């Protein structure tokens, strides 16, 4: 029983593949040998605890480095002219120009400038000194230690929970909606009201004076007497400076809307009310399902009773409760689908409605924070679709799902794949033809001959929000609508002042280039959805190979016969759609960074004239913003962007190195390693050294994964460098 011990079939492999696949089949717990239901769910539960401990031990070190090597107090004194320091650098390979050039933010040595928005976050939430961040780091060290204790505890046989506890979906949803989403957002509200609002108003509220510092002039009297408007009585004025007592109000739960006029960020009183609202509604929504007390819902009978009587949905959702509850890949795919749609809702709502103080002014931090959640969301959504494919191979029972909606997806799967194919082809011919046409017209000396389409649907939606720039004047931009008159005394005085401003990123002025790149975005989502729906629905089998389910999920191919069956598996469709999410989110974040990099220095006409054709994208965005990127180090000297100039070139290595695994395939390298094995076995003084693992080439799935991971690492490092060097070196 060698490594890997979870799979007996890989332990008898005498090659290097045994070393490789044991790393990659390490967390695929259900594919293990001598493996049961209880061990599956308990190992997944303790792996969740280890994941929670890693997240909290990560946050602890991102708090410890700000408290220890970062100037959080100096950034708190002046958040506009001080660069936030992540951590100090101890590199033995620096020369004296590198030590003298990485010393930023008034530090004593070479430090890294934090582009993660942790200073803006911790400032808005109430943390002011380094001692508060250190106490938070020790507290989250304790929390991660408690989660390690709980992870070890639930693997002990006294505290092992059974699968019936794990598959209790009603109790899990009630205690998740009530506890995880309700009492934590009500806990939050208690922080935002007790700590963050008085620290925005200058009052230092800590644990020593928690029971004495009253958050309102009349606290908990008007709450229980019903007059809640006392908590919205005296809001913060427009002369309020953040962190100071002057210009401040006393109301803890306002409904002002819009932005704080000095930080260009959301009001802590609004976010406190926001959390009291997504706390009351989640504790009320957490009393829905039936657990132990007679009242509630059984979701099995909800899904059984939700059948349309015309038969257009077949049996409806009958048999889907056992389908989700028995399949961990269905629950994980649903969780990652929801998580991608909310990690992208995170990205879309922290740039346009900045929630943290002095985050809108720090431009490259905002750029990093958008690109972060759009790449983490384009890998979470692809993981959702890949887990739908793994559900259809190793977890979907056609007998249990008989003529329900999930079986009817397989019944008309060629219609879904062909219509996603039509939509992708439509968007591709139209977007490419219009961009290439606008390229030809700028090439042929005639900018007026472009097909420029004003995006009047989304401009109509912006005028429906309150933008008076386009002059549609339908609702919330005209005073004759009932929605405006229902809102003009309640939230719209903040919202209209925030949306009619042209310096912020709240619902920006869009044009024909925005139309064209939104069809690029629709092309990217549609073609990624095409490959992923095609992988998920041809997961069990297809007309080329009907027994794809009996070959597992991530099998390489089926041989050169029947024309050729390369990339036939559903993992290979996931593999081909990782390139499409990289291209999609590359287009998304190209559009974001160029729409904002022209907004921040003022000349939005550069984007309005140049984004309609791809030579403007190549020249005015990829070439123009890379001026101080690749000049980070020269023969003459090196700048502070030099690490971002190396990380850019580094990306062009790793990405191109992926091509070595994605173009060249196995048997060339297998014969090459055969010649290498002969050469080592015949070389004098080196033949004495043996291998225990037989040297083989990388296997076919492993080759696609290694090329895909290299492609992804190079792709995220070329853009992390360019994006954090073409905004942080030319601020604006």
């Amino acid at each position: 029983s060698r490594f890997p011990k979870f799979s007996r079939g890989l332990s008898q492999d005498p090659t290097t593949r045994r070393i490789w696949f044991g790393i990659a089949t390490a967390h695929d717990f259900e594919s293990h040998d001598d493996m049961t239901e209880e061990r599956l769910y308990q190992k997944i539960f303790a792996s969740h605890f280890g994941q929670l401990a890693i997240i909290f031990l990560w946050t602890s070190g991102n708090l410890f480095h700000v408290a220890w090597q970062g100037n959080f107090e100096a950034w708190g004194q002046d958040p506009l002219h001080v660069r936030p320091i992540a951590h100090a650098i101890w590199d033995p390979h620096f020369g004296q120009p590198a030590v003298e050039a990485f010393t930023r933010g008034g530090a004593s040595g070479p430090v890294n400038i934090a582009y993660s928005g942790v200073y803006q976050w911790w400032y808005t939430i109430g943390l002011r000194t380094n001692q508060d961040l250190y106490g938070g780091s020790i507290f989250l060290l304790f929390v991660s230690a408690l989660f390690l204790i709980a992870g070890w505890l639930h693997l002990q046989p006294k505290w092992k929970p059974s699968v019936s506890w794990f598959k209790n979906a009603e109790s899990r949803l009630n205690h998740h909606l009530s506890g995880l989403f309700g009492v934590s957002s009500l806990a939050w509200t208690g922080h935002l009201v007790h700590v963050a609002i008085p620290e925005s108003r200058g009052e230092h509220v800590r644990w020593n004076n928690l029971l004495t510092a009253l958050p309102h002039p009349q606290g908990l009297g008007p709450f229980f007497a019903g007059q809640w408007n006392v908590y919205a009585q005296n809001p913060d004025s427009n002369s309020h400076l953040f962190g100071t007592s002057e210009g401040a109000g006393t109301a803890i739960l306002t409904f002002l809307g819009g932005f704080h006029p000095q930080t260009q960020s959301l009001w802590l009183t609004d976010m406190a009310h926001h959390h009291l609202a997504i706390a009351v509604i989640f504790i009320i929504a957490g009393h829905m399902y039936r657990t132990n007390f007679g009242i509630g819902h059984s979701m099995k009978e909800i899904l059984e009773a939700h059948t349309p009587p015309g038969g257009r949905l077949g049996r409806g959702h009958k048999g889907l409760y056992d389908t989700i509850n028995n399949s961990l890949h269905f629950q994980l795919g649903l969780a990652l689908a929801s998580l991608g749609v909310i990690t992208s809702l995170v990205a879309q709502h922290m740039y346009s409605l900045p929630p943290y103080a002095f985050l809108a002014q720090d431009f490259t931090t905002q750029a990093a924070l958008y690109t972060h959640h759009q790449y983490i969301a384009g890998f979470i959504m692809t993981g959702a679709f890949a887990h739908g494919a793994i559900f259809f191979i190793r977890d979907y029972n056609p007998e249990q799902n008989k003529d329900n909606v999930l079986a009817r997806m397989l019944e008309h799967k060629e219609a879904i794949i062909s219509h996603l194919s039509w939509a992708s082809l439509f968007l591709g011919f139209h977007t490419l033809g219009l961009y290439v046409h606008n390229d030809v017209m700028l090439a042929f000396g005639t900018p007026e001959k472009q097909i420029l389409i004003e995006p009047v649907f989304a401009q109509w939606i912006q005028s429906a929000h309150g933008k008076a720039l386009y002059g549609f004047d339908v609702l919330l931009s005209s005073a004759d609508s009932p929605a405006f008159n229902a809102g003009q005394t309640l939230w719209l005085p903040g919202w209209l002042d925030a949306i009619n401003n042209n310096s912020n990123s709240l619902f920006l002025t869009i044009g024909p280039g925005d139309f064209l790149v939104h069809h690029a975005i629709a092309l990217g989502l549609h073609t990624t959805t095409l490959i992923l729906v095609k992988g998920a629905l041809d997961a069990r089998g297809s007309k080329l190979m009907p027994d794809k389910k009996e070959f597992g999920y991530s099998f390489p191919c089926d041989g050169p016969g029947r024309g050729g069956t390369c990339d036939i598996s559903a993992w290979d469709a996931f593999y081909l759609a990782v390139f499409w999410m990289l291209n999609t989110i590359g287009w998304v974040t190209f559009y974001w960074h160029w729409k904002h990099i022209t907004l921040w220095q003022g000349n939005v006409a550069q984007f309005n004239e140049s984004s309609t054709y791809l030579m403007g994208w190549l020249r005015d965005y990829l070439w123009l913003n890379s001026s101080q990127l690749i000049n980070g180090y020269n023969p003459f000297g090196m700048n502070s962007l030099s690490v971002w100039a190396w990380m850019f070139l580094f990306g062009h290595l790793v990405w191109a190195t992926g091509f070595m695994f994605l173009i060249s395939w196995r048997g060339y390298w297998q014969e090459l390693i055969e010649t290498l094995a002969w050469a080592h076995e015949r070389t004098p003084l080196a033949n004495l050294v043996r291998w225990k693992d037989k040297p083989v080439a990388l296997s076919i799935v492993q080759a696609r994964l290694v090329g895909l991971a290299h492609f992804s690492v190079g792709y995220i490092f070329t853009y992390a460098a360019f994006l954090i060097a073409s905004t942080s070196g030319k601020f604006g």
Binding site: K43, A46, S47, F49, G50, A53, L57, S60, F64, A67, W68, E73, N130, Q131, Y134, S137, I138, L141, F142, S144, A145, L148, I149, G151, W152, L155, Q156
Partner: peptide, 30 residues
């Protein structure tokens, strides 16, 4: 700014956390 002795408190509490991470990894093995 934090002090010298507070770094000692953090390093012990991370080493205690590193033991509890080592204890879970032994139990995840078994």
């Amino acid at each position: 700014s934090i002090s010298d002795s507070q770094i000692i408190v953090a390093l012990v509490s991370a080493f205690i956390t590193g033991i509890l991470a080592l204890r879970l990894g032994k139990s995840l093995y078994q």
